[PDB]
Amino acid sequence: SMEQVAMELRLTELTRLLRSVLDQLQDKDPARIFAQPVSLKEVPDYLDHIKHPMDFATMRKRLEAQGYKNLHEFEEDFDLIIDNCMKYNARDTVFYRAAVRLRDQGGVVLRQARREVDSIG
């Protein structure tokens, strides 16, 4: 149908905007702490602690499959990155501190992305 195509074009455009958002958030992680999944070889007990692991590579795979239907789903995954790190790692660690900085810097980006999503529709 033509409606299905129009909906597919909307999803494609949302994907384009989320790619730009993802790039901007990932630049706020210049140490690449959140770039890849936590290694179960190196942290064998990780899944005893963290039930839904997340990282930027995993988000990018989902994004490129057009697997985010709306900005709320994308934000949920971003928040997992932060929130998982702040639970597993103590306050005095470079990891926890990196997460706090990512959260604070990413908030700005996400605030305008929400306005852009509502605005463009």
Swiss-Prot record:
Cross-link Glycyl lysine isopeptide (Lys-Gly) (interchain with G-Cter in SUMO2) per UniProt, renumbered positions: 41
Residue intervals of the Bromo domain: 9-113
Free-text tissue specificity from the UniProt record: Highly expressed in testis.
Location(s) in or outside the cell: Nucleus; Chromosome
Record's function text: Scaffold subunit of various histone acetyltransferase (HAT) complexes, such as the MOZ/MORF and HBO1 complexes, that acts as a regulator of hematopoiesis. Plays a key role in HBO1 complex by directing KAT7/HBO1 specificity towards histone H3 'Lys-14' acetylation (H3K14ac), thereby promoting erythroid differentiation.
Assembly behavior: Component of some HBO1 complex composed of KAT7/HBO1, MEAF6, ING4 and BRD1/BRPF2. Component of the MOZ/MORF complex composed at least of ING5, KAT6A, KAT6B, MEAF6 and one of BRPF1, BRD1/BRPF2 and BRPF3. Interacts (via PHD-type zinc finger domain) with unmodified histone H3. Interacts (via PWWP domain) with dimethylated and trimethylated 'Lys-79' on histone H3.
Identification of the protein by name: Bromodomain-containing protein 1
Residues of the full protein shown: 555 to 674 of 1058
